[PDB]
């Protein structure tokens, strides 16, 4: 008997950034720290998916801002 | 500037089970395979959270059943 488990895993990270960092840049920092490929990363803030070529300042992302990220992995 | 990213990660696993396995047992298999502590595991099927001392048969979980799991981790 084989069953399938759709595992949804929640982990909170902190990131050291400049307002001038692009979204692409942030996804690279998340890869460097957590191993999530950036093309599997969907960064979310204030009700939007964020576009790679914009900066954190473009989205008024200020310090202690709380973003979300949804990713798919094959293995942890 | 420190920001916080709430990362939600999705990964699908398959598990080799008997109808007679308890929920507790399944969470142990998921720990053994993925490293998620079983006390951080919330197994979900057909609209319910599953209770540790019940068996997969108790929930009519049949082969190719699709369960969900929600967990918190400190690190991947």
């Amino acid at each position: 008997m084989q069953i399938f488990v759709q595992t949804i895993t929640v982990m909170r990270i902190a990131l050291e950034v400049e307002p001038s960092d692009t979204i692409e840049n942030v996804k690279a920092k998340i890869q460097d720290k957590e191993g999530i490929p950036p093309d599997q990363q969907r960064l979310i803030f204030a009700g939007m998916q964020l576009e790679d070529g914009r900066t954190l300042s473009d989205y008024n992302i200020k310090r202690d801002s709380n973003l979300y990220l949804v990713s798919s992995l094959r293995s942890l | 500037m420190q920001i916080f990213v709430q990362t939600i990660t999705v990964m699908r696993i398959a598990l080799e089970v008997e109808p007679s396995d308890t929920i507790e047992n399944v969470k142990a298999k998921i720990q053994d395979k993925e490293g998620i502590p079983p006390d951080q595991q919330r197994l979900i099927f057909a609209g319910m959270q599953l209770e540790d001392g019940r068996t997969l048969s108790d929930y009519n979980i049949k082969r190719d059943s699709n369960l969900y799991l929600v967990s918190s981790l400190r690190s991947l």
Partner: peptide
């Protein structure tokens, strides 16, 4: 996992407000 990803994105968009 596209259909679960779209759902979770939609949920994370909600949570972000």
């Amino acid at each position: 996992y596209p259909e679960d990803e779209e759902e979770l994105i939609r949920k994370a968009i909600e949570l972000s407000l």
